[PDB]
């Protein structure tokens, strides 16, 4: 089976950048056979090249490929931040039919400091017996971010789960959400509630906070 | 217009067997190739089986993984091409997408998951999340369900600027996730602001209302 490798797997560039994508096929493939697939989240793979070099329609003219035998690649003239999503390079030129790893490839941007919310467990989860605490890090650059809790002013570590979305789309930011899972009988021990976040190249936290 | 309808997903005990129908729209489907195509969070991106057209000696051909428990077959007369498995197994859990190939030109459907567990369906719970500026964020908290996935709109689509809906996390062998919108505050609490949820494989739907505390 002709093996596909696209390295690296993660790639940034700014906007307007010239950006190339390698894909590294095992054995020969025939030009005509080889295809690269375009997926952003929420979406299925969109067919983004075909036959190394040829686009489908309403693929944007900046898109180009190019390549033979054993190596081909991807080229996009000028970075735009609608370009930041998944590309899978593709061969079906001998069965099976493989695919690539993939390459998640980012659009840089400016510092923005994340949007924190924090929301406390509702009356209908008390009714149940659980009580989750959940904290919203919003529209924040760059990826890397940092989040803590206080519960009446000690430091909390445990039963937190985190969550990230991809960069999105219109201003190229990310978003985590920060979920604490408690008892109902530990949650109604404790009357302040305290999500913070704080970015390792920076002293002043974003923090929010409640009162039971 | 272009359109490939896939159904037959869901939730399968290892062993159990279940077949996934694909009904295409659009286009001479005796003319065009058929794949099923699985992406899943720990094997990627992979092909899983092919039957080409009539004229082109109506050949199937199967990924090694499947090869002997999965059948592809395709109905022309009624445009539809479908995937059977048998001894369904851990591995096989992923989003199925049925794909169509005319000249070069190949045309995805939406996919549809099939999750191979022990474990039962298990419908979620749904939990509204107001606040205790010139613009305020709810949410809802989904939480307890399997398998995947889970749907997330506002106000029926209508709201879908300014939405964070993040991946599902696994707790206590159930799933989680959240999503949040942000709005200004003179459509909120003014205008009603509602999530609904959807989660197919239990048939259920919950429009949570986000009513201010």
């Known amino acids: 089976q002709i093996v596909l490798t696209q390295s690296p797997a993660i790639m940034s560039a700014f906007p307007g950048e010239r950006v190339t994508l390698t894909c590294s096929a095992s054995?020969?493939?025939?030009?005509?056979?080889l295809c690269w697939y375009q997926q952003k989240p929420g979406s299925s793979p969109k067919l983004w090249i075909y036959?190394?070099?040829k686009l489908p329609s309403g693929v944007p003219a900046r898109f180009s490929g190019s390549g033979s035998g054993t190596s081909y690649s991807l080229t996009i003239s000028s970075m735009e931040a609608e370009d930041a999503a998944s590309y899978f390079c593709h061969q079906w030129s001998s069965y099976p039919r493989t695919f690539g790893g993939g390459t998640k490839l980012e659009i840089k941007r400016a510092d923005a400091a994340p949007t924190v919310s924090i929301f406390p467990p509702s009356s209908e989860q008390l009714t149940s017996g659980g009580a989750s605490v959940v904290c919203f890090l919003n529209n924040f650059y760059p990826k890397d971010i940092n989040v803590k809790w206080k519960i009446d002013g000690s430091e909390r570590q445990n039963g937190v789960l985190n969550s990230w979305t991809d960069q999105d789309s219109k201003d190229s930011t990310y978003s985590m959400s920060s979920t604490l899972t408690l008892t109902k009988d530990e949650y109604e021990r404790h009357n302040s509630y305290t999500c913070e976040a704080t970015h390792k190249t920076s002293t002043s936290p974003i923090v929010k906070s409640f009162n039971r | 217009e272009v359109k490939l309808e896939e159904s037959g997903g869901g939730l399968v005990q290892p062993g159990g067997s279940m077949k996934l129908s694909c009904v295409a729209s659009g286009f001479i489907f005796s003319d065009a190739w058929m794949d099923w195509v699985r992406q899943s969070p720990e094997r990627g991106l992979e092909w899983v089986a092919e039957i080409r057209s009539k004229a082109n000696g109506l050949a199937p051909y199967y990924a090694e993984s499947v090869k002997g428990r999965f059948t592809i077959s395709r109905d022309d007369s009624k445009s539809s091409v479908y995937l059977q498995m048998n001894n369904l197994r851990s591995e096989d859990t992923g989003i199925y997408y049925c794909?169509?190939?005319?000249?070069?030109?190949?045309?995805w459907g939406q996919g549809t998951t099939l999750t191979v567990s022990s474990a039962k369906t298990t419908p979620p719970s749904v939990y509204p999340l107001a606040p205790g500026n010139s613009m305020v964020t709810l949410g809802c908290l989904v939480k307890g369900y399997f398998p995947e996935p889970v749907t997330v709109t506002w106000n029926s689509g209508s709201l879908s600027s300014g939405v964070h809906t993040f991946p599902a996390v696994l707790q206590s062998d159930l799933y989680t996730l959240s999503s949040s919108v942000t709005v200004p505050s003179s459509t909120w609490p003014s205008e009603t602001v509602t999530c609904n949820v959807a989660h197919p494989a239990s048939s259920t739907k919950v429009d949570k209302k986000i009513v201010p505390r």
């Open positions: 036959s190394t070099s």
């Open positions: 054995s020969s493939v025939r030009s005509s056979y």
């Open positions: 794909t169509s190939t005319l000249y070069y030109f190949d045309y």
